[PDB]
Amino acid sequence: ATLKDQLIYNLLKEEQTPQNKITVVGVGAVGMACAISILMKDLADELALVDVIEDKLKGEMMDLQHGSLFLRTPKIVSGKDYNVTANSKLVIITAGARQQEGESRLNLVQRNVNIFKFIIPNVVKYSPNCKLLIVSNPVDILTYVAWKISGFPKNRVIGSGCNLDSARFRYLMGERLGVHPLSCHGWVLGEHGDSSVPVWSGMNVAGVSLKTLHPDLGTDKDKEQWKEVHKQVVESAYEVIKLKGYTSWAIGLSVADLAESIMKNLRRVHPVSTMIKGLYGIKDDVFLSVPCILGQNGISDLVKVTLTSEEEARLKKSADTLWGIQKELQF
Amino acid sequence: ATLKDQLIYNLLKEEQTPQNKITVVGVGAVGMACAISILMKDLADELALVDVIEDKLKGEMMDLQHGSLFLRTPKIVSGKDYNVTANSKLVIITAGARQQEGESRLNLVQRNVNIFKFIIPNVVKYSPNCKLLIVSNPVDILTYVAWKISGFPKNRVIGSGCNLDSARFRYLMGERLGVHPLSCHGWVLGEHGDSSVPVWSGMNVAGVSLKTLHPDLGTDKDKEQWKEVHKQVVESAYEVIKLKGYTSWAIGLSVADLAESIMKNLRRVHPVSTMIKGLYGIKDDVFLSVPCILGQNGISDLVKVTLTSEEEARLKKSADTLWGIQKELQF
Amino acid sequence: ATLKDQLIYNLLKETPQNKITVVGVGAVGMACAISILMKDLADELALVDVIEDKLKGEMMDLQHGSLFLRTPKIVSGKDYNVTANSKLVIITAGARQQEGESRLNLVQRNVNIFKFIIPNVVKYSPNCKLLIVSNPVDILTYVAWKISGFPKNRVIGSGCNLDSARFRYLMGERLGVHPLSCHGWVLGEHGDSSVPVWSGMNVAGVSLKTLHPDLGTDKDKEQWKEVHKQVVESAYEVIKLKGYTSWAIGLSVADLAESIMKNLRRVHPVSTMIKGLYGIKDDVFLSVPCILGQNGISDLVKVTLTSEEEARLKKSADTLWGIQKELQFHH
Amino acid sequence: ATLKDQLIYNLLTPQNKITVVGVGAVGMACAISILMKDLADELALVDVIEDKLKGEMMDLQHGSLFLRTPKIVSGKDYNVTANSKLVIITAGARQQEGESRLNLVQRNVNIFKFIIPNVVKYSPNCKLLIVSNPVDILTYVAWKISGFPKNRVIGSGCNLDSARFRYLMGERLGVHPLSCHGWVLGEHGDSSVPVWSGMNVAGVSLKTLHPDLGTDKDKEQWKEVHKQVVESAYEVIKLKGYTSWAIGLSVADLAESIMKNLRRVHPVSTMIKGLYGIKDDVFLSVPCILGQNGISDLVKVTLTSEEEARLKKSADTLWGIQKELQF
Ligand SMILES: NS(=O)(=O)c1ccc(Cc2c(-c3ccc(F)c(-c4ccc(Oc5[nH]nnc5C(=O)O)cc4)c3)nn(-c3nc(C(=O)O)cs3)c2CC2CC2)cc1F
Ligand SMILES: NS(=O)(=O)c1ccc(Cc2c(-c3ccc(F)c(-c4ccc(Oc5[nH]nnc5C(=O)O)cc4)c3)nn(-c3nc(C(=O)O)cs3)c2CC2CC2)cc1F
Ligand SMILES: NS(=O)(=O)c1ccc(Cc2c(-c3ccc(F)c(-c4ccc(Oc5[nH]nnc5C(=O)O)cc4)c3)nn(-c3nc(C(=O)O)cs3)c2CC2CC2)cc1F
Ligand SMILES: NS(=O)(=O)c1ccc(Cc2c(-c3ccc(F)c(-c4ccc(Oc5[nH]nnc5C(=O)O)cc4)c3)nn(-c3nc(C(=O)O)cs3)c2CC2CC2)cc1F
Ligand SMILES: NC(=O)C1=CN([C@@H]2O[C@H](COP(=O)(O)OP(=O)(O)OC[C@H]3O[C@@H](n4cnc5c(N)ncnc54)[C@H](O)[C@@H]3O)[C@@H](O)[C@H]2O)C=CC1
Ligand SMILES: NC(=O)C1=CN([C@@H]2O[C@H](COP(=O)(O)OP(=O)(O)OC[C@H]3O[C@@H](n4cnc5c(N)ncnc54)[C@H](O)[C@@H]3O)[C@@H](O)[C@H]2O)C=CC1
Ligand SMILES: NC(=O)C1=CN([C@@H]2O[C@H](COP(=O)(O)OP(=O)(O)OC[C@H]3O[C@@H](n4cnc5c(N)ncnc54)[C@H](O)[C@@H]3O)[C@@H](O)[C@H]2O)C=CC1
Numbered sequence A, B: 001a002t003l004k005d006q007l008i009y010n011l012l013k014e015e016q017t018p019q020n021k022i023t024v025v026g027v028g029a030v031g032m033a034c035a036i037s038i039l040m041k042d043l044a045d046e047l048a049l050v051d052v053i054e055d056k057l058k059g060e061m062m063d064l065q066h067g068s069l070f071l072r073t074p075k076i077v078s079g080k081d082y083n084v085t086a087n088s089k090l091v092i093i094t095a096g097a098r099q100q101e102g103e104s105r106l107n108l109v110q111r112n113v114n115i116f117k118f119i120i121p122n123v124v125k126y127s128p129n130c131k132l133l134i135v136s137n138p139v140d141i142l143t144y145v146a147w148k149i150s151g152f153p154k155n156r157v158i159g160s161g162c163n164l165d166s167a168r169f170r171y172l173m174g175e176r177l178g179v180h181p182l183s184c185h186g187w188v189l190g191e192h193g194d195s196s197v198p199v200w201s202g203m204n205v206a207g208v209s210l211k212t213l214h215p216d217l218g219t220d221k222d223k224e225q226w227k228e229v230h231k232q233v234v235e236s237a238y239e240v241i242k243l244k245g246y247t248s249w250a251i252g253l254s255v256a257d258l259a260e261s262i263m264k265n266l267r268r269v270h271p272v273s274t275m276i277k278g279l280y281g282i283k284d285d286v287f288l289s290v291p292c293i294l295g296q297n298g299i300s301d302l303v304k305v306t307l308t309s310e311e312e313a314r315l316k317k318s319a320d321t322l323w324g325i326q327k328e329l330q331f
Numbered sequence C: 001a002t003l004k005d006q007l008i009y010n011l012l013k014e015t016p017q018n019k020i021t022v023v024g025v026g027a028v029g030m031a032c033a034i035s036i037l038m039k040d041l042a043d044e045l046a047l048v049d050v051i052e053d054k055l056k057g058e059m060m061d062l063q064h065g066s067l068f069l070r071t072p073k074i075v076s077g078k079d080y081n082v083t084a085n086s087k088l089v090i091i092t093a094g095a096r097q098q099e100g101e102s103r104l105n106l107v108q109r110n111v112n113i114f115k116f117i118i119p120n121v122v123k124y125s126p127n128c129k130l131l132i133v134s135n136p137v138d139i140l141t142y143v144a145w146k147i148s149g150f151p152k153n154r155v156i157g158s159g160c161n162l163d164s165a166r167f168r169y170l171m172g173e174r175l176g177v178h179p180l181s182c183h184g185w186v187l188g189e190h191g192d193s194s195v196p197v198w199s200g201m202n203v204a205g206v207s208l209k210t211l212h213p214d215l216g217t218d219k220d221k222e223q224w225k226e227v228h229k230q231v232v233e234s235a236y237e238v239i240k241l242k243g244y245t246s247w248a249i250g251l252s253v254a255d256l257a258e259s260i261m262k263n264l265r266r267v268h269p270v271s272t273m274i275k276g277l278y279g280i281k282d283d284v285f286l287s288v289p290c291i292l293g294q295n296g297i298s299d300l301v302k303v304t305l306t307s308e309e310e311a312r313l314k315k316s317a318d319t320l321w322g323i324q325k326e327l328q329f330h331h
Numbered sequence D: 001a002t003l004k005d006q007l008i009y010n011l012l013t014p015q016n017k018i019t020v021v022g023v024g025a026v027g028m029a030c031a032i033s034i035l036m037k038d039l040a041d042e043l044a045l046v047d048v049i050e051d052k053l054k055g056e057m058m059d060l061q062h063g064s065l066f067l068r069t070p071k072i073v074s075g076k077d078y079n080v081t082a083n084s085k086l087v088i089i090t091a092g093a094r095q096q097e098g099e100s101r102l103n104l105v106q107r108n109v110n111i112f113k114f115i116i117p118n119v120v121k122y123s124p125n126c127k128l129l130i131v132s133n134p135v136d137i138l139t140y141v142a143w144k145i146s147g148f149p150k151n152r153v154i155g156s157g158c159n160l161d162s163a164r165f166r167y168l169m170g171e172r173l174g175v176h177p178l179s180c181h182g183w184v185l186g187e188h189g190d191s192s193v194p195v196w197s198g199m200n201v202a203g204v205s206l207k208t209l210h211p212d213l214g215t216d217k218d219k220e221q222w223k224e225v226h227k228q229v230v231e232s233a234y235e236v237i238k239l240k241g242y243t244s245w246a247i248g249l250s251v252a253d254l255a256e257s258i259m260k261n262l263r264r265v266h267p268v269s270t271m272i273k274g275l276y277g278i279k280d281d282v283f284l285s286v287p288c289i290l291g292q293n294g295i296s297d298l299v300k301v302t303l304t305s306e307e308e309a310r311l312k313k314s315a316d317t318l319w320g321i322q323k324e325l326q327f
């Protein structure tokens, strides 16, 4: 007989479903940073990669496979066909179009909508019960798009949203105070990037309100210019894009953090993009980052943060802008 | 007073030495994969990045820094100046030239020698007691080069060598047997890549010699073609390079594995590139992969593998070829 | 409304996906529990015992450490409804040896405990894997198989996984090498009658037996037999010194659990139904190297034994069948 | 030659050493938690009971295959503790029937009289992490006997009390304790102070949403959460005879911040003379920044008059006991 059969007596032919499967759709720098972070945190018994670029897809799958000795994730698979994604608990969408010279920003969005038109129904056919974690920008709009196309309930369609913006805020806060970001608390809500809202009232170390110690916190009067911390949350992202061409490491770690809460049913609170119609006087179908409880059914609950009238007004304006763009999209 | 001073009462000024510092020189795909793997395994209290490309360097450092909330490595620093590398326990060189159109292979090696001429003396000035882990290709030759330029004792100059080749071997072994690579034992020794030597006599699951069960193992008459496993160790590396343009994830994980043994003083046995003059009838100053015991002083010991005359001959030929190339290099 | 309802908007009313039960919260069960919690192998840990105060106190002590763990549900009770939907159920329950009590009486008392435990485990987790730790472990694994009616893939004894770990510790002390890099198998019975397979002892795939043919014989000037004597004697020594063993078995069980819960297909020396091998004709469980994954034991490795090694297993099988015939329970 | 020499050609101080003094249930829970978090390259155990000590060391050693801590040693001689970055004291006397509580304290002082100078001789630069009860008093005792600066003498303090608070908070809100923020300060156990003003999820003040929070009028009885912080500890002691797992995990958390220089903020017991109107040499839990030099910095928490009053009373009570102790 074969060497395998001389060495190994088989007890069962059984094939068996994967119990903790994650799919990443889009194997650019962002998708692969999600993949390595997820592999290094042991969140999956099976990792499936999907892309349209066959060579990049196969090469990334093989490079990870060659590291199997150093991992505890026993099955890594890839393909263009969504049958490789079957029975995923969680499917992370990092797929996007590359901006072309001589193209409007609405056209870039529409091109990402058309990608979602192909991706989302295929994901749903093979993993009807999965949670969808949307990373692709524009992330708040494309989370809406994935919800509409999927027909999933809102608990199972999640945008990565302000989880990274909040992590940057805490890094910068930590540098100012000489304290680890874990111990520096502070929330950025609403839109990912330029229009994000820093909730100054929630900024604390050891439950000590910085706003209470320093009432000028987050105003133009402020002698220490704490507003510059939130400006750097937006600008440092543009800075990394200008300096290396894209961001990967921080978003990959952020997504692995959301994946951890979902796969282990932790019910930790993260600022992610959820369907917010009914709150802060928003009457339209838009996704914005508020603090949500993440577990095995996706978003089970969200935290109603006490905002100032000004903070409430910024979210209403964001909802108006997002509904305006959403009405102009073709499904 | 300032918000910091209202919130935080300082007890002590002077900030001491880092106790578990790692430097990565070269922030390409390989250096950054080493960095993320090291960060995700908590092997360092301080990670220093060095490159010549200031924008890429700063951008990569900032991208990692933005992830600090998700890591347990409190200090991430970068610069062109080697003062940022001061007091490193371990310094990983992933710095290399990009092959030019029309450039000869000897010229590419000499250009990497000239990079080492700048890097190594600067590394030594700021971390005179560090272990050097050489990753840059050609890795066996450049480990020799780093030893000569550094003046370090041979215990503290290590090539990543066949640790990755051995991991690929075990991956492929595992696919054939339906067994995790951790439980599939097999050694690839000598040169990294094309001229690596599979030691068929050491291939085992649970201490059961595959060679003893199947004496044709690793010969041309073999009906199961086990030689194809070692062919794929070389060919799969070229395949990933063809498919994505380079390899990163597997080498990053391999280097983090060596770093773990060194930083934690594990005295695990790894196939790494060490100065092998005096063994297997090699009379020249060459570095080849044999199984070494790795700990806090680098290579303390090496394992004397019983080789066939053919296996011994392949290492002698590798030593001759490496000494031939080495005497043609200019310091 | 309530503080909860002012703070949190609920989206959905709330099954565990990765549940582990430990039956018996003695020193052994609790060492298994802390090891499992510290390796993040479960989303739910259930504890069962007959001593309600000890059980509740241990559950509460673990719960109070929740902040430092990533296992969001810890539950206990004497009622097996708390064990419902376990992937894996670890039996560490046992009677305390009395002065003057016969060996057969101790075994029968543990059989009577299994008479209550096993059918209750099966009712609430009909698809679980059973990991039997309670001594005598090879006999009680047989007992659990017969009472459960489970197929043999889903009934596993911890067996010689600990004996093999002790062997490698001792091997490592003699060679100055980490136990991870010291390979050596103890098979057959847990404890006194265990068989060291000298032929499989290797570092880096180098046979110690081939280098030193006296290895494991009485002629041996270095007395390597003393390594296997210490595998048995060091266990008795720890029992004499602290009254019991806990930490090593806890870590060993967490290692098996890791392979099962993550479907790793790593090879461990565990106790499996071995009728049909090495000329054994009776229904006995002995430790051979098994492939562990999500369906329990999928495959065995057929180790090449000497006639002497084969004879020791046959004698063990005869002794175990002799004791098994004298036990009272229904299948 | 020997098999070792046939197999291995030889070519050629611990960097991250932790000592645990006292190998009861508490010391060994600290040890397993530290081993399972990879915080040490060397673990040293010390006790006075030589057989228990040797047995515990051997049991851990037998698990080496499953660990990444390559050297585990024990002995009654403090030479095994040489060059420790961190030394955790879980050593203590067992309460005797009819023995007074001041006598139990003095007996623990006499144990520290032997332990602390030996620890200092072999690891003059170590951080001392004091766990033994009464923890705030015995931290003072270790500081006085050691002559160490206050940055390098740390009590485990309210790190565990704060973890219990967050567990209970989490059960009430259906949220992971990681995401439930709340601080217990001052004395470990009975006289601990819950800072209601800092209780938050996602930076949302529970006090602001529900101003009765932590008053007796409160219809939801949130004070019961802090009552359970104290009572649940007594409950575990009544049910299993002692606590081990939660304190072990808590100490591993402090050790992680110290060994990796994280500068995370923990409620640990530090020398508080000069702060919150305390005028005596006493150790109480306030939020401290922990790193490779021990406590580098304190967070100055804004307390209510009532919270401030509880700490000042604790300082008075602790100084009263401390002036009656014999060195
Ligand atoms: N709330 S929202 O969904 O609508 C939304 C709007 C805009 C952005 C900006 C944006 C884009 C992004 C890409 C593609 C796009 F097409 C758009 C976009 C921009 C503007 C749009 O609306 C219009 N602009 N001009 N005309 C229009 C219109 O359609 O009317 C639409 C899309 C943004 N990516 N991206 C990245 N972030 C990172 C990181 O590391 O944090 C790396 S990249 C960022 C954030 C930037 C770093 C700070 C992120 C968001 F989530
Ligand atoms: N023992 S050695 O140090 O001398 C040595 C020789 C050759 C190589 C081949 C090589 C090179 C490599 C790069 C740059 C170079 F300049 C050379 C090289 C080739 C030939 C050289 O010298 C000559 N020999 N005979 N004539 C000549 C000549 O000078 O023309 C010198 C350098 C190789 N990279 N590289 C990579 N590996 C990976 C991965 O994932 O495993 C990704 S890339 C590989 C391995 C191959 C993919 C499998 C790896 C080695 F380690
Ligand atoms: N293959 S087998 O199932 O039959 C079997 C037999 C004997 C033992 C011995 C044994 C027992 C043990 C307890 C209670 C028992 F009742 C028995 C037992 C053994 C054999 C019996 O056989 C008989 N029944 N009736 N007559 C006989 C007879 O002897 O002829 C009955 C009870 C063992 N515990 N135990 C522990 N190990 C550790 C540790 O850390 O390694 C901690 S404790 C050990 C191992 C010893 C330290 C090295 C472990 C085994 F797995
Ligand atoms: N801040 S302090 O240093 O002064 C101090 C005082 C009292 C205690 C109480 C205490 C003791 C403890 C043991 C021995 C003792 F001797 C004392 C003690 C009590 C009162 C004393 O003072 C007096 N005795 N008689 N009169 C007086 C006086 O007031 O003058 C002295 C010692 C407590 N252990 N212990 C444990 N905790 C746990 C756990 O998991 O949390 C497990 S055990 C606990 C905490 C309680 C379970 C919740 C913990 C502390 F930190
Ligand atoms: N949410 C956040 O905070 C952040 C989001 N991002 C977003 O992540 C996305 C990806 O960024 P990068 O990886 O750098 O981009 P990239 O362009 O490198 O990769 C996107 C990938 O999507 C693939 N793709 C396109 N159409 C596809 C289809 N139909 N099916 C499958 N795959 C398809 C492409 O082939 C490509 O590999 C972008 O939208 C980016 O803005 C980036 C950083 C942070
Ligand atoms: N030993 C092994 O098993 C493997 C080794 N490698 C080697 O790793 C090296 C890097 O690979 P990639 O990341 O793909 O290359 P890359 O070309 O993307 O990056 C190398 C980096 O070195 C930098 N550099 C050049 N001169 C420098 C100097 N004087 N000081 C500091 N930095 C300097 C460059 O700026 C560049 O960022 C290559 O030599 C490659 O062959 C890669 C695969 C496996
Ligand atoms: N397989 C191995 O390598 C090893 C096995 N062991 C075995 O582990 C077992 C436990 O060891 P220790 O924890 O030291 O024992 P222990 O006597 O301290 O605790 C055993 C626990 O079983 C509980 N128990 C008894 N009847 C029960 C029932 N009907 N349902 C549920 N729980 C029940 C007891 O109440 C007790 O809490 C022993 O049989 C021992 O021989 C221990 C060492 C190594």
Ligand SMILES: NC(=O)C1=CN([C@@H]2O[C@H](COP(=O)(O)OP(=O)(O)OC[C@H]3O[C@@H](n4cnc5c(N)ncnc54)[C@H](O)[C@@H]3O)[C@@H](O)[C@H]2O)C=CC1
Residues within 6 Å of the ligand: D021, D022, D023, D024, D025, D026, D027, D046, D047, D048, D049, D090, D091, D092, D093, D094, D111, D114, D115, D130, D131, D132, D133, D134, D135, D156, D157, D160, D188, D242, D243, D244, D247
């Ligand atoms: N700070 C906190 O939050 C908590 C503190 N603890 C404290 O932990 C301590 C230990 O608790 P257990 O392990 O249950 O106690 P235990 O009495 O079982 O163990 C204490 C050990 O100290 C040893 N010891 C006594 N004198 C010694 C000396 N001169 N040198 C070295 N070792 C010596 C004893 O031999 C014994 O093994 C107690 O003080 C307890 O109150 C307990 C839980 C929580």
